[PDB]
Symmetry: D3
Subunit: 160 residues, 6 copies
């Protein structure tokens, strides 16, 4: 079986937790699409072009990762990408509840897209893009949670 | 005992999950007030008049349902409506936590108003007005989650 | 005439159970407090002791009927012509199991509606199990139990 | 050739387990449904009964292999050359224990990736334990089990 | 050991739940800094000066409490205050999840600052500043949840 | 002089317990690591074995006192003149039970303040129960336990 999997999200910015999940996905599936949502409702810190470029560079060492931006409903994009596997990272209980609702909805929308939940390292089990940004905004050290290129862009973003 | 129960919420829009809960409430209590909150803080998709009209039409087949709009504190409205039963739908754990806080607060405000928790069908256990709207905004099919009249109004709303 | 059933092991009946059954009696015309034989749990008190303790602790509530049962819930509720099943809400861990039971009970008897009532903040952190555990270590449990239940628990542990 | 393992007690195998293993077979080339001896749990069905029931209930799935094991998970998975470990997602209480198992299994065998699959809403509130409990009270469990499993459960309880 | 503990938060406004937690902290630690975050992102009902004055007056009877405002990352402030104990109140499961994420982040930022979780009275286990304000805005009685001075300021705030 | 008590079964004491007690010693002047007789749980190690293992595993911490007790928590804490009760935070399921215990303990002894400490991410997914389970299947548990505890666990399972 030559499986195409999709790993969607805002990735604003991509963290070491996302790198962990996408690395596990590439060791399991032949082709992994890391799909970055335009997500204008969330009003992201980084533009879609910035998020795509940051994720491309942070996953460049992974030969079977394709970084792409998308604005549709995830399931509409996934169907057009011929993906049958939907990657989700489960860190804790709060994730679980919302992720079950999304997975049942996604299954209603596209039954041929199977949601799979991967578990990150204990190291990234307590972080989110939101928390990292918040700590960074308040002059806290977030170097440990981010790829080098992402850390450099976050510093540059917060300086201006 | 000739019980008057109140089922409050934003109902923006009323879903099949809300119809399920209010149908269970009508089989248990003599009179059920489906109370629609003005809720301007949430900035609803549908005006109060639209939400009331949609809920009226979606519950018309239930003879002991009264659809009414309200702007007060729920408990202030419930006291003026001579309701002693407060209907809440419990879908999952996240609901549970917030619902317990609301129920203890509502009990402090009006001890004679008893909070009762009803459980929806497995079918509606993973949906919310918020998720349905989000999927609809992103060009996803939500026909299965809504009464026909609500589906028609949601399509019309998103077209303009 | 609306008939509700409040099932459980009630090993022993606590102030938390009295709170839930009192709320149920203010809402429904007749409330059956149904005590499960529950031999799998290996209860401290026999079904007869549990029934007698609950009868005496609810005697002041005119619309409560205390009955013992070994039946499947759905069957006993149908046989009792009840259409409402009362459960108390405590913790998330209780809630999850309660949803599984409620969906099972609904499959078995769709006309039996599960209703969840919320106890006083006072009883929101107690269980029959925790009260027994405190009492096994000679701790003061007078506050959590009806007087007759407290007396029987002391007598049992002596 | 991607080899996945779906471990558990399967005492007995339910429609929820059939749902999870069917999803696993549509994703992975070979799926080993691994039945734990689990003597600590004191199962209703022996390992041999559990294996025979699961074999027959999954016979229609060409890429499922039913095997019994008493080994440490990580060891049996290495010995079976599997790199994927399938778990089903039910409740938060299941999820928490599943995270502990998955982190332990990762410590023991880092190349064994735990994957969580979500069952149909239909089986989201059932467990082998709850089905057995319903059956112990003579309740209708035909809907939750494969026919062969239903027949063996009735025979066992008779 | 002459321990300095910090109890951070928005305290918008300080409630009986916060008074309960800070009272427990003062019975355990020599000096307790009740640290009020400027928190402009949350857009607080009360200004920082109002929140500090309200908390000062509501804790005046506690001799080892110091009420101070701060705008830094909490951990940056805590380090400059020579605090080695970080007080958090745990009411319910939802608190727990977010509090674990914050505590691991705070530990990364300042390992010498130990997070300690205190449990409030059952009486305050179902309230928050947010819920109290919401009930007050909707003409509900919140007298029981607040110190007298806070209740007076909340009434005055909502009248204008 | 601030005296804290860290109670539990400690069957056996793990690196997670060592982490919690080490954090407690950095915060409080004297820490009593209190080992419950806990016969209801039917422990793998006797109270004497559990005390000896914990004594040796905490010997490097000068302000730790390891003591066995069969008393009610509130009584032993009063008798030990402690005003702080240390608990570790793991999972939501642990947290819920911990709140019930803490409210009960507060009813019994209001001057005994329950404090929750958070372990390292390293020990956030382990328990004495899970470590024993891994060891029962001959799995490598050297990483989760003090050396003396690992040796006693191997000897016990042999
Ligand atoms: C598991 O599916 C995800 C996860 C994170 C996501 N962030 C953005 C999207 C795409 C737009 N939104 C959607 O498609 C829903 C279903 C309305 C949420 C997205 C999808
Ligand atoms: C169970 O009581 C509800 C549930 C959903 C609700 N949505 C809006 C309201 C009315 C206004 N708000 C209130 O009355 C609170 C108590 C401040 C929330 C409402 C009430
Ligand atoms: C909410 O329903 C309850 C709660 C507590 C209960 N204790 C005993 C029973 C009856 C026997 N058991 C059953 O009928 C099930 C559904 C198989 C568990 C019972 C039912
Ligand atoms: C997700 O891993 C599972 C799930 C269910 C299981 N039932 C039996 C096993 C194998 C023996 N147990 C182990 O190897 C542990 C890790 C010590 C528990 C098993 C593994
Ligand atoms: C347990 O630490 C808290 C708790 C509540 C808090 N409210 C505001 C702050 C200060 C600014 N924010 C931060 O320092 C984080 C770490 C980015 C949240 C604060 C800190
Ligand atoms: C947080 O308090 C604990 C935790 C673990 C414990 N293991 C044993 C005890 C003492 C005996 N038990 C009690 O005193 C209760 C309160 C009745 C359970 C103990 C206490």
């Amino acid at each position: 079986m030559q499986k195409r999997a999709i790993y969607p999200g805002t990735f604003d910015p991509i963290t070491n937790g996302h790198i962990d999940i996408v690395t596990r996905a590439t060791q399991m599936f032949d082709h992994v699409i890391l799909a970055i949502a335009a997500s204008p409702s969330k009003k992201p810190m980084f533009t879609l072009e910035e998020r795509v470029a940051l994720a491309q560079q942070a996953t460049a060492h992974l030969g079977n990762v394709e970084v792409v931006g998308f604005s549709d409903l995830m399931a509409n994009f996934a169907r057009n990408q011929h993906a049958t596997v939907l990657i989700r990272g489960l860190r804790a209980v709060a994730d679980f509840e919302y992720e079950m609702q999304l997975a049942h909805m996604n299954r209603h929308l596209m039954p041929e897209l199977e949601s799979v939940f991967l578990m990150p390292s204990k190291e990234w089990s307590f972080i989110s893009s939101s928390l990292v940004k918040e700590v960074a905004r308040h002059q806290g050290d977030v170097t440990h949670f981010l790829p080098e290129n992402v850390h450099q862009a976050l510093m540059a973003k917060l300086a201006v």
